[PDB]
Structure formats: structure tokens, C-alpha cells
Amino acid sequence: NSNICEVCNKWGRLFCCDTCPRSFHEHCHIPSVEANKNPWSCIFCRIKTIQERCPESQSGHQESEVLMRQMLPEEQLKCEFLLLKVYCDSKSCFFASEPYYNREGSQGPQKPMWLNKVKTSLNEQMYTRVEGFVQDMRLIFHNHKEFYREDKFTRLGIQVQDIFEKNFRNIFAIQETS
Ligand SMILES: [Zn+2]
Ligand SMILES: [Zn+2]
Ligand SMILES: [Zn+2]
């Protein structure tokens, strides 16, 4: 196994996947690494199994159909994995914890949102459709862009949204378009 967390790239108290060489901090993996379970397989491996069991699941889909899916166990896992992919980028730090807003010439968003809040919401099974999770994720970056206006810091929201969107299209097998 790797000797650094797959998500944050640091060493520490690491749990190793039995079916692949990746390793994780307890609360870096999503869901948090399970108490017992020998052997244990990471989210990466669980996602690869879904694909392998239903090869046609990789055929293109329309975003509108994906959003309307109910959050059955496979969709729950796909959203957990998508969230984890965002935490894998170091720029996610800006979006992880609860924000506050006090900048001359700007007003804070009406509905603040952050990654740890989406993570708690997934853990608590608060989303009934994929659309609820995707809407909160896109709201994180939209709030950032509107608040930071012409400050160059706005770019961090564009960057981390691009990671989210590329991974959304991959994980949910969105039909490729020009
Ligand atoms: Zn970690
Ligand atoms: Zn694995
Ligand atoms: Zn099949």
C-alpha cells in the first residue's frame, strides 16, 4: 500500500485498502473508514465494482436524467465518491469549512454552503435525489464567484468547480458533447 493518504497526501494513521494499493486517513475517506470489515475495500474499488457488474452503466447519460435519480445505495456511493474527488484537490481547503463574509462592496450569500456541510448531509441521508447534492455543490462555487466579484480570488471557485464538473461527468457517465 501507499504510505500517504490518497485524499490529503500526508502520512499519519492510515487505513489500507485490501483490493488496491491506496491508503486513507479515517475521515478523509468518504464514507469514514468503517470500524471492522476485514477485508476492507475503498470507495475507488467499490465504484469500479459497480462498473464491472454493469458495463452498460458507462454508456452516455443525459444530466437531466441523472439529477432526477433517487438516492438509492449506488447513487449515494457515487455522490460520496464525487465529493471525495473534490477534497482530493488541495484547493478544496478554501471551500471546506463554514465561510464568513465581510468585504467592502459585497454582501454575503443568502444561502451559504461548504464541503463539510455537504459531507454531513450525505452522512445523514438528507438528499433524496442526486439533484439535491449537485445543487449544493454548485452553490458553493456560485456563492464564491458572486461574493468575490472582480477580485482575482474568484478564480479559485472556477478551478474547484472545474474539478467537480469533470468528475461529475466521469462518475455519472454523462454523454460527451462539443
Ligand atoms: Zn488524509
Ligand atoms: Zn481500493
Ligand atoms: Zn449487467
Side-chain angles (χ1 to χ4, degrees), residues 1-36 38-178:
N1 290 77
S2 181
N3 311 330
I4 54 173
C5 179
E6 191 76 356
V7 184
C8 73
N9 300 106
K10 297 290 194 276
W11 178 74
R13 182 56 190 117
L14 300 177
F15 302 85
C16 289
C17 183
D18 290 311
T19 52
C20 84
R22 299 177 176 89
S23 304
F24 305 82
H25 303 108
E26 176 163 10
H27 297 307
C28 287
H29 198 273
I30 312 179
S32 292
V33 168
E34 298 71 14
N36 209 291
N38 315 61
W40 180 73
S41 276
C42 81
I43 188 146
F44 293 78
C45 286
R46 299 171 64 188
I47 288 284
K48 187 206 298 304
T49 294
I50 302 323
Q51 284 173 18
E52 285 177 349
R53 291 174 162 160
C54 287
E56 68 268 35
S57 70
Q58 296 159 290
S59 293
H61 296 81
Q62 298 298 110
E63 180 175 312
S64 61
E65 176 271 320
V66 166
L67 298 185
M68 293 300 315
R69 297 177 187 164
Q70 297 181 12
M71 286 286 261
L72 298 181
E74 293 190 351
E75 305 320 300
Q76 174 79 29
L77 193 75
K78 287 174 162 209
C79 294
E80 288 166 348
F81 186 47
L82 179 47
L83 181 57
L84 175 137
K85 289 290 200 159
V86 175
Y87 282 101
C88 287
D89 197 282
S90 63
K91 293 162 177 285
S92 68
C93 64
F94 294 108
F95 299 108
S97 72
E98 187 174 1
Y100 62 86
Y101 299 94
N102 196 2
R103 181 196 187 242
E104 182 181 331
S106 285
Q107 272 287 334
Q110 306 288 314
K111 185 176 167 178
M113 192 52 57
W114 58 99
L115 301 167
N116 293 352
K117 181 173 177 77
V118 181
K119 181 179 276 200
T120 291
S121 299
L122 278 174
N123 174 241
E124 293 184 2
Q125 294 159 312
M126 303 286 291
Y127 298 115
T128 53
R129 291 172 192 274
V130 173
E131 174 180 46
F133 167 81
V134 172
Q135 287 173 336
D136 276 353
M137 293 291 287
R138 289 173 168 164
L139 183 62
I140 295 172
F141 313 114
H142 194 263
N143 286 347
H144 177 97
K145 292 166 67 183
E146 293 300 305
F147 182 68
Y148 291 109
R149 302 294 198 106
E150 310 302 276
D151 194 293
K152 61 191 182 174
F153 192 62
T154 58
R155 181 158 172 265
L156 269 297
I158 294 173
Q159 292 175 320
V160 181
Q161 183 150 23
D162 194 38
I163 299 296
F164 173 73
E165 294 299 344
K166 284 179 185 285
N167 283 281
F168 175 73
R169 292 191 303 268
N170 179 261
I171 292 163
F172 287 95
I174 298 294
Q175 174 59 53
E176 289 280 285
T177 56
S178 43

